[PDB]
RNA sequence: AGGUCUCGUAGACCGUGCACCAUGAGCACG
RNA sequence: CAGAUACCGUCGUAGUUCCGACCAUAAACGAUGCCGACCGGCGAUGCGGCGGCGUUAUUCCCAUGACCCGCCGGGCAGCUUCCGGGAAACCAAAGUCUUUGGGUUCCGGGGGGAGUAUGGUUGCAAAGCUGAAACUUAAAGGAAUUUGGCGAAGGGCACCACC
RNA sequence: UUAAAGUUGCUGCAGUUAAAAAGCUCGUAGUUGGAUCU
């Protein structure tokens, strides 16, 4: 740190709760907007529908087309 | 990258520099980034001197000078050939070259 | 032009360093000593070192050694090296002395001497010819 | 077959009239040929390649590849030495950058932690390195412990006599010549460190090469 | 130098010094060079202590005599007035003279021909021969310069602080160095002068050499 | 503006140790400096030390040798357990062979090492070795 | 006191490139070139078509 | 593209969005 | 270096710098084994006897070693007070 | 009383200025 | 000009000028917050003070202004380096940092989305401050070498170029 | 989710050129405060 005095801790702990607020994976944990996002909805397994399969094509230097559901 | 020691000019505690023209283009430049020619010529130098010089009515006249004093633009100045460009090592080095002519 | 390669000169300059005693200041004699000392499969480049040879044999008398050492110690000079004048040029009788060192010379192990005298401050007005 | 000195310090090597290495050091004397090492030092000397990589500059022909090849030497209860070499076929450059490591070898002490008990196993004190960007720290372990590090300065742990440490490691690690030459600084400078024990004043006998002067004169020319 | 009184200015030393003009230096003063000066003269000539200067010169022929190879110990000289005082040093003391543009690598490059193992190295100015110095710097090899007051000190263990654009006083001082060390080597009583001739030292310009043999038989 | 004597005065004895200088001269005084340098003074790490003491705050030029590594000061001046201190120069002495760190002790400044045998501790001020 | 090989043709892949090994003193030009090195020139035949062998 | 012009742009988009939702209410 | 049994297991001990007190390294190749001689009390001659010291590189490459010769040889007793 | 003072050489610029430039179908081998 | 509502030329409104009322944005850059301590040299510059041969406002005497030789303190700056640092350009600070703590404000976390949407706030307006998310991506970037490529500047050679 | 992350840095990060010091100044809270008393 830089701010370096004996009878101050609350300037330390607020910066500090600054900068881990102003971050990417901390910010994408302790938000609700990106648990409300997700499709599964914060679970590991979910399940679903089959209704369309279609095949998508891949990317520039790999050339095939991958087959795929939507669900 | 930094370039040079200085900024391309001699500003180094005023911040603003009264601009000027150039003289073949019309840019406002600052006056310590522009390159001052000052050249020191006559009227006629030598294609019609001594033609003068039995055709005057008084003998043994000086021919007066004219002064004049000129700013140039950087690409006005490389343009015209005023001015080149060395390498990194010979770049330092602020004494003017040697006017044998 | 007459520009020589670089090995006829360092075989001169090998040749030289290492005979100087039976070398001569003769085109043709040192032809047939460099016969004589080194084997040389061809004609044009005995020519060549026998007369870059007596071009630097004749330059070496000619004046001062820059390119090579010496063995012989260079006689031509080293004779002159070998006179010794009758007058020592350092014994004057008159030494001209500046106050400042006479000064600096009392306070040291002597005080006034013959060979010494003191001259008056030559300061006209100042020094330090004008380059900033 | 037979090696033919060409300094004055591999004469006297060749002389045997200089008893050890160890002198030398004392003296700071420079080496310039690969022959006192492996006349003094027996045949504990271990060599392990540590990278082989390609570097090239691009002309009309292409580009012309060369290769860089690391590679440490030294005995495993002292020495140890590092040599970077680049040419052109490999087995050059690994000959090249062994000869290179073998010339640039230096002495190390080793410390105690709490008691001078046994023979010494540690670092005597908490020595770092610089090259480049990384930086790399020697901390002293307790008996027993074992080195913690990355592969390549724990190989060249062991092969430098130590077998217990803590090390730490700060910059960019992945490019090794950098981080092998820093663990190297860190280990040479074992003995740039004052210590209280070493407070006396120093003797100082006659130098290597006063010894031997009558010796060198009719043997050396 | 000795605090016994057997090595001082007796009657002449500082007859030679005045006479060859070894007090005065140059006009520029190095801050290396605060103690060995006097006072500075008038028009900005600084006066270099002629005391310290030959305790110095004491001091560097006593490293001389200390080792006992005379071979060696290496002088260097590349300026035009020095090539004879090195060469008549060496020919009175049996040291290697280099006179006259020092190839770099001689100490350092072992397969090369010019490849030399000195103990001792003895230069002329520090200046215009930076590169010997720097080259010795990779070995373990004391320096010892003559240096002016205008020089700058680096990689220099013994500095004798004298004037050198003077050939007089660079002759005169490397005749009297060969002559102390001769002395305290034990080959020259002090009781007489040995002395053979100071000016043997000395170079002497081409048109010089002429005008003296004209004058001279 | 200067706010620490002791941090500045021994800035500069180690910044003069790292330049090879003999003698320094620092500007300021007070008593803990003159107990800190007499702490190494008995440790052996500095011989001779002097002060030049006018009408107002004195100078004290010390006679240094080459026997000194680095000496460091910590800001602020923080508390020290006899359980922490073990803690403090585990991290802070480069050995435990060697190196001394003091601290004020409510009996006078001294080091660590008297204050293990003394069950005592207190503020910390800085440590050398 | 020297050596040259260069084998030229097809070497692992389609096109032909030509390849060479170079070691020790090569001399080009003159005439102590015709009484000190030796040229051979010999055809060598594969499935895939014919490689160039020449030694100096 | 230079950001000076984008942002010109970007700004005169700004203006036509937010002076259509002053003649939307 | 003393162990607690009391042998001097430490290999060698390195060179100390007469002018700062600082180690020489192994590899620091910038040091001397300066040698001055004596002279006799009576007659100025050789006798034989050396008085050794060492410099540091950093001393030589950081601009002033000659000084700090001055320094050791007043110590000696080489170098006259008055100087 | 003479009549052509002696020696060496860059002393060089100066009605001189130029329109007309858009695009790249791809790309090996161990 | 293929295509000019561009480079160019001739006119030309609002402004460019002043007085009062507004907004608070720039490459507002030394792209380097403020105070204080320590750590090399050199030569000049501007201010104030101090000391010392000599010349001048004509010739003798004082201090004054001009000039020369040093010194002190503050400031704009310049050259060199194994003090040291840095990824390197380079730096007397960007040094005194794993051997990590002199005191104290603001601020940055891959690249976009985006200084965007929304809300608040200020303003007659233009806009200023505060300031996201969804989604997408394995790169985006900073220094410095080798032929390269210049509608960049020079230098050299050639009767397959010229005179 | 933790260590690796000295990529949240209190120990222990950075702010000339890689992301970065408000355009500058004053100023209330909070932070830090010269020497000296056995
Ligand atoms: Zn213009």
């Given at each position: 740190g830089k701010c370096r005095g004996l009878r101050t801790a609350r300037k330390l702990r607020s910066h500090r709760r600054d900068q881990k607020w102003h971050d990417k994976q901390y910010k994408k944990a302790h938000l609700g907007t990106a648990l409300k996002a997700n499709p599964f909805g914060g679970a590991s397994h979910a399940k679903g529908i089959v209704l369309e399969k279609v095949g998508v094509e891949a990317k520039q230097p790999n050339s095939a087309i991958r087959k795929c559901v939507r669900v | 990258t930094k370039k040079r020691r200085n900024n391309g000019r001699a500003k180094k505690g005023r911040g603003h520099v009264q601009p000027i023209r150039c003289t073949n283009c019309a840019r406002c430049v600052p006056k310590d980034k522009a390159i001052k020619k000052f050249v020191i010529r006559n009227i006629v130098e030598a294609a019609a001197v001594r033609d003068i010089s039995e055709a005057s009515?008084?003998?043994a006249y000086v021919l007066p000078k004219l002064y004049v004093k000129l700013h140039y633009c950087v690409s006005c100045a490389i343009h015209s050939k005023v001015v080149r460009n060395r390498s990194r090592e010979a770049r330092k080095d602020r004494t003017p070259p040697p006017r044998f002519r | 032009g007459r520009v020589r390669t670089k090995t006829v000169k360092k075989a001169a300059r090998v040749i030289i360093e290492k005979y100087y005693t039976r070398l001569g200041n003769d085109f043709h004699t040192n032809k047939r000593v460099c016969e004589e000392i080194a084997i040389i499969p061809s004609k044009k480049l005995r020519n060549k070192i026998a007369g870059y040879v007596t071009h630097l044999m004749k330059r070496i008398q000619r004046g001062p050694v820059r390119g090579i050492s010496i063995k012989l110690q260079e006689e031509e000079r080293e004779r002159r090296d070998n006179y010794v004048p009758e007058v020592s040029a350092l014994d004057q009788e008159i030494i001209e002395v500046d106050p400042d060192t006479k000064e600096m010379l009392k306070l040291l192990?002597?005080?006034?001497?013959?060979?010494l005298q003191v001259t008056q401050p030559t300061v006209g007005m100042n020094f330090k010819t004008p380059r900033g | 077959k037979e090696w033919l000195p060409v300094t004055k310090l591999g004469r006297l090597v060749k002389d045997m009239k200089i008893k050890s290495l160890e002198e030398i050091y004392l003296f700071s004397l420079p080496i310039k040929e690969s022959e006192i090492i492996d006349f003094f030092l027996g045949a504990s000397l271990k060599d392990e390649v540590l990278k082989i990589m390609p570097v090239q500059k691009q002309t009309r022909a292409g580009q012309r590849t060369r290769f860089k090849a690391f590679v440490a030497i030294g005995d495993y209860n002292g020495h140890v030495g590092l040599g970077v070499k680049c040419s052109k076929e490999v087995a050059t450059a690994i000959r090249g950058a062994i000869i290179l490591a073998k010339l640039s070898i230096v002495p190390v002490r080793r410390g105690y932690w709490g008691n001078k008990i046994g023979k010494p196993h540690t670092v005597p004190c908490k020595v770092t390195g610089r090259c480049g960007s990384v930086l790399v720290r020697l901390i002293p372990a307790p008996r027993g412990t074992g080195i913690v590090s990355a592969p390549v300065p724990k190989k060249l742990l062991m092969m430098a006599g130590i077998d217990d440490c803590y090390t730490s490691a700060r910059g960019c690690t992945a490019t090794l010549g950098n981080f092998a030459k820093a663990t190297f600084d860190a280990i040479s400078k074992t003995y740039s460190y004052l210590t209280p024990d070493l407070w006396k004043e120093t003797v100082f006998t006659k130098?290597?090469?006063?010894?031997?002067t009558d010796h060198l004169v009719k043997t050396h020319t | 130098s000795g605090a016994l009184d057997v090595l001082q200015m007796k009657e002449e030393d500082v007859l030679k010094f005045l006479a060859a003009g070894t007090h005065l230096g140059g006009t520029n003063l190095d801050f290396q060079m605060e103690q060995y000066i006097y006072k500075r003269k008038s028009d900005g000539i600084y006066i270099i202590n002629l005391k310290r200067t030959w305790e110095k010169l004491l001091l560097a022929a006593r490293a001389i005599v200390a080792i006992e190879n005379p071979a060696d110990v290496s002088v260097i000289s590349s300026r035009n007035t020095g090539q004879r005082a090195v060469l008549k040093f060496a020919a009175a003391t049996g040291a290697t003279p280099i006179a006259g543009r020092f190839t770099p690598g001689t100490f350092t490059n072992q397969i090369q021909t010019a490849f030399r193992e000195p103990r001792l190295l003895v230069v002329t100015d520090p200046r215009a021969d930076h590169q010997p110095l720097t080259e010795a710097s990779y070995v373990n090899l004391p320096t010892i310069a003559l240096c002016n007051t205008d020089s700058p000190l680096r990689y220099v263990d013994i500095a004798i602080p004298c004037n050198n654009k003077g050939a007089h006083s660079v002759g005169l001082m490397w005749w009297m160095l060969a002559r102390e060390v001769l002395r305290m080597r034990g080959t020259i009583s002090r009781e007489h002068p040995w002395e053979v001739m100071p000016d043997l030292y000395f170079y002497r310009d081409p048109e010089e050499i002429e005008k003296e043999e004209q004058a001279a038989a | 503006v200067r706010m620490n004597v002791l941090a500045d005065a021994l800035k500069s004895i180690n910044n003069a140790e790292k330049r090879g200088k003999r003698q320094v001269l620092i500007r300021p005084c007070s008593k803990v400096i003159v107990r800190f340098l007499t702490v190494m003074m008995k440790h052996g790490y500095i011989g001779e030390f002097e002060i030049i003491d006018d009408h107002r705050a004195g100078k004290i030029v010390v006679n240094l040798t080459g026997r000194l590594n680095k000496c460091g000061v910590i800001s602020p001046r923080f508390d020290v357990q006899l359980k922490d201190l073990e803690k403090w120069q585990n991290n802070?002495?480069?050995?435990?062979?060697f190196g001394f760190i003091v601290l004020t002790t409510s009996a006078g400044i001294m080091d660590h090492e008297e204050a293990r045998r003394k069950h005592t501790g207190g503020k910390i001020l800085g440590f050398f070795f | 006191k020297g050596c040259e090989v260069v084998v030229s043709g097809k070497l692992r892949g389609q096109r032909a490139k030509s390849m060479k090994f170079v070691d020790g003193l090569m001399i080009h030009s003159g005439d102590p070139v015709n009484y000190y090195v030796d040229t051979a020139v010999r055809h060598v035949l594969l499935r895939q078509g014919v490689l160039g062998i020449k030694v100096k | 593209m230079r950001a000076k012009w984008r942002k010109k742009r970007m700004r005169r988009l700004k203006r036509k969005r937010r002076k259509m939702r002053q003649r939307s209410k | 270096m003393q162990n607690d049994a009391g042998e001097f297991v430490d290999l060698y001990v390195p060179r100390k710098c007469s002018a700062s007190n600082r180690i020489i390294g192994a590899k620091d190749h910038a040091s001397i084994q300066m040698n001055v001689a004596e002279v006799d009390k009576v007659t100025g001659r050789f006798n034989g006897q050396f008085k050794t010291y060492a410099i540091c590189g950093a001393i030589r490459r950081m601009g002033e070693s000659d000084d700090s010769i001055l320094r050791l040889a007043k110590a000696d007793g080489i170098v006259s007070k008055n100087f």
């Open positions: - | 009515v008084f003998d | 192990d002597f005080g006034s001497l013959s060979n | 130098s290597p090469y006063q010894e031997f | - | 802070l002495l480069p050995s435990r062979q | - | - | -």
